[PDB]
């Protein structure tokens, strides 16, 4: 899935791909809170949490990506870069 | 322990969203496939 | 002719009488349907959509 | 002199007697005597009265007393009651209060109300105000109407659908239970129909308008008749030396918001020397606050004597029941969108459509309420004798009839065909309902109310969302489809303010689901949910406040509707891949007959009567679904499907058996595209 997101050339094609990585990552979470609601594992708790960090951290990306897909098609579209530069909002170095 | 369940719901939702952003980007990238460069001369 | 040409004069007359409400108008039809600018696309690729 | 109140052994109050004197005067009143006789004498009254004259106050007081009367001297027996029908809810409580008033005792008590979603009746209520359909739902638990002694059908003019059944049933009442009074009163002077329809019943005539009015005519016949009202509003307000307010009558809001604009323009015109006109939209759908508008006062008038006014703009909302005070200029094209559902092709249509004979008495009467008034109505003489019909058609002529023929089944009504219909539906539609609720297993194939029928007439609802209900319970979907059948019980919840169009639309959008405008509703109604119902919130993301708070309302009273047959409330798992799937396939379950596909053309036609149908604009979707689940065939200026949603055609074939069965269906695309699922699925 990371490397598709990084050569998906269309939007078109990169929201099939995103879309099912997020349903993926959807369900891992799902199965392993379950289990975790039922062992009480503690370290299992703590690998859950550490799995919730990552499933958050994909969301975050989803704006970067998108931004970026389009920046592959045509990356003349400065209407786009100006977005790549508010997706940056948060790193001055970045921008 | 309900704090993950609680997160859960927020993230599905956010999922959710994030689907129907995608479909935004999709039909706007049809009409700027059907359109070509001479829409911006 | 003379029964013709008070007719078409009339109405060479009647078309240029007002010609402004109807040229201001047809400008502003036109101006505003120009800066409207997109109307939604409604795309059908039904085979991506299943 | 102390006259004791008969209903609480009190002293009348002192304010009694006042309002007392003004209702002698009312013109009703001088019958009084003369009514109680024809009672005495007849088992079934036809009265007439024109607005004003006090009928719907004073008549349902004096068969009080009538009952007393007969009480008097007999043991105290069994409580029987006298009950007043209204065609509105806004009515129906609008006359209990005053009444509640004139006979000195407490609302709810002697004198009550029963309408929806609020009963005010105690166990000493005599009088019961009701709505139409109150007492069209308190018959199909107790046919013979079994707790009343004097009925009274006001309003008969409206024909509405509650109403036509009701006549038929009563007449039917007045065989069997041989002692109960039927008072049918209505306002229009109409023909005496009433009177045949009841074996030549005495007819009663009271006139009482309160100020004489004056109609007008233009004697050529405009073409343009928006060109002509804007036109003429102006002309009023600038012609015109009494004070009052202009109330001109248009079609619906493509046009309402276009003559506010319009009219805007030419009084910026004249400038200071002319009143300021101030124009108010006012359309059923209307937030609030938007409505409260027409309370509100004219300007105290330029300095220099010109008369400022307000005008309102308005659909038939302003011809009955909403009572504008302050106008005395009516302005009447002589149109309104009248709804003609066309039994042949389902096409349900809202075209531009003359008014009546009545109708334009009735928006003429709104002048001479404060003072006498003028009517100016935008067409000829000549024109109104011979081409406006002379009453407008009732609502039984022009609607499908699902709805009501499952009531009058749960009624036990079986001859349907024989149904004594004062103007009886066309043949063409009844057969479109018996079609209709035998898909959906309401009815059997001799025609005798099913195990699955008998419950779909227990819910206030349409007869497919009752199917798709039901049906959801056991789809282990129903909270969710609970929610979407309140939404589309109710009138539409999007706002869209044409000066705020483009802002409005993006609130919509923000709210849109991805599958098409019946998730979009629950999207909506779980929206309205989260954020406490608060009125602002409803109020910057384009929603009326009155539909979403009337839709939660709805959805209690379904709730407590499931509860008495056992349906358990249920939801899918959040968590669930089944959560949006099974709610898609609940809505299929139900409205699988208004299902319609994506042809090679780039239209839609719709499954089996092949009438080609666009997408609504309004709709939610960014795509053309292949396969769309369609709840309002609409004619305005083209064919539109209204709340399109996608469904997947294996639904079709699993949850909707009958229908879709390949073997019936007429050869063409639709069959083509269905033959190919079903043999995949296999």
Partial sequence: YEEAIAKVSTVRDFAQVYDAYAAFEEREVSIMMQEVEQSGDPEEEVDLEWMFQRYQHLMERKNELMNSVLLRQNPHNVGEWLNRVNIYEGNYNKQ | MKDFNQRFRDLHKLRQRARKENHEQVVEEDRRSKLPKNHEA | ASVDEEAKLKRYLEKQARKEQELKEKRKAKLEKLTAGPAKHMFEDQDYLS | ?682
Wanted: negative net charge; hydrophobic residues 40%; charged residues 25%.
């Fill in chain 4, 1 to 682: 002199k102390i006259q004791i109140n008969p209903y609480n052994n009190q002293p009348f109050s002192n304010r009694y007697w006042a309002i007392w004197e003004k209702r002698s005067q009312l013109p009703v009143w001088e019958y009084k005597e003369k009514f109680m006789e024809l009672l005495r004498n007849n088992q079934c009254i036809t009265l007439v009265g024109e607005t004003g004259s006090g009928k719907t106050t004073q008549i349902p007081q004096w068969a009080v007393e009538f009952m007393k009367q007969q009480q008097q001297g007999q043991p105290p027996g069994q409580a029987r009651l006298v009950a007043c029908t209204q065609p509105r809810r806004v009515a129906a409580m609008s006359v209990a209060t005053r009444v509640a008033e004139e006979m000195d005792v407490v609302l709810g008590q002697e004198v009550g109300y029963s309408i929806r979603f609020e009963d005010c009746i105690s166990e000493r209520t005599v009088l019961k105000y009701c709505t139409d359909g109150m007492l069209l739902r308190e018959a199909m638990n107790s046919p013979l109407l079994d707790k009343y002694k004097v009925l009274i059908l006001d309003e008969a003019h409206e024909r509405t659908l509650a109403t036509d059944i009701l006549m038929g049933l009563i007449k039917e009442i007045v065989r069997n239970r041989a002692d109960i009074k039927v008072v049918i009163m209505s306002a229009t002077l109409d023909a005496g129909k009433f009177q045949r329809y009841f074996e030549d019943c005495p007819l009663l005539s009271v006139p009482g308008r309160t100020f004489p009015v004056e109609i007008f005519f233009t004697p050529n016949a405009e073409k343009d008749y928006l060109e002509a009202a804007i036109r003429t509003v102006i002309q009023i307000h600038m012609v015109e030396e009494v004070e009052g307010d202009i109330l001109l009558f248009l079609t619906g809001q493509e046009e309402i918001e276009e003559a506010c604009k319009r009219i805007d323009r030419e009084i910026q015109a004249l400038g200071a020397d002319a009143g300021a006109l101030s124009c108010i939209p006012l359309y059923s759908t209307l937030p609030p606050a938007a409505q409260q508008r027409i309370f509100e006062p004219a300007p105290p008038n330029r300095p220099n004597g010109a008369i400022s006014r307000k005008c309102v703009i308005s659909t038939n909302i302003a011809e009955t029941s909403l009572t504008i005070d302050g106008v005395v200029f009516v302005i009447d094209p002589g149109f309104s969108k009248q709804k003609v559902y066309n039994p042949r092709i389902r096409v349900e249509s809202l075209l531009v459509c003359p008014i009546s004979k009545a109708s334009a008495m009735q928006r003429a009467g709104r002048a001479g309420r404060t003072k006498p008034g003028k009517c100016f109505r935008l067409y000829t003489e000549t024109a109104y004798g011979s081409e406006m019909q002379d009453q407008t058609y009732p609502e039984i002529l022009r609607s499908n009839l699902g709805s009501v023929v499952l009531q009058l089944k749960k009624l036990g009504t079986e001859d349907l065909v024989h149904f004594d219909f004062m103007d009886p539906p066309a043949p063409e539609t009844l057969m479109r309902a018996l079609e209709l609720l035998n898909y959906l297993q309401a009815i059997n194939d001799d025609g005798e109310l099913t195990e699955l029928g008998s419950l779909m007439a227990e819910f206030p609802l349409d007869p497919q969302l009752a199917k798709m209900l039901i049906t959801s319970t056991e789809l282990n979907c129903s909270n969710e489809i609970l929610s979407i059948t309140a939404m589309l019980s109710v009138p539409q919840c999007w706002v869209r303010p044409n000066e705020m169009r483009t802002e409005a639309d993006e609130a919509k959008a923000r709210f849109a689901h991805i599958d098409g405008d019946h998730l979009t509703l629950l999207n909506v109604y779980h929206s309205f949910k989260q954020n406490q119902e608060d009125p602002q919130w409803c109020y910057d993301n384009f929603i009326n406040y009155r539909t979403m708070k009337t839709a939660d309302t709805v959805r209690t009273q379904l709730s407590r509707v499931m509860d008495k047959y056992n349906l358990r409330r249920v939801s899918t798992d959040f968590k669930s891949r089944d959560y949006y799937l099974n709610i898609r396939k609940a809505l299929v379950a139900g409205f699988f007959m208004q299902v319609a596909h994506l042809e090679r053309s780039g239209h839609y036609v719709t499954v089996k009567d092949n009438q080609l149908v666009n997408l609504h604009p309004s709709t939610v979707l960014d795509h053309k679904p292949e396969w769309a689940l369609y709840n309002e065939f609409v004619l305005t200026t083209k064919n539109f499907i209204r709340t399109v949603t996608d469904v997947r055609p294996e639904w079709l074939l699993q949850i909707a058996p009958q229908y879709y069965d390949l073997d019936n269906f007429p050869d063409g695309d639709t069959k083509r595209k269905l033959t190919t699922v079903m043999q995949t699925l296999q």
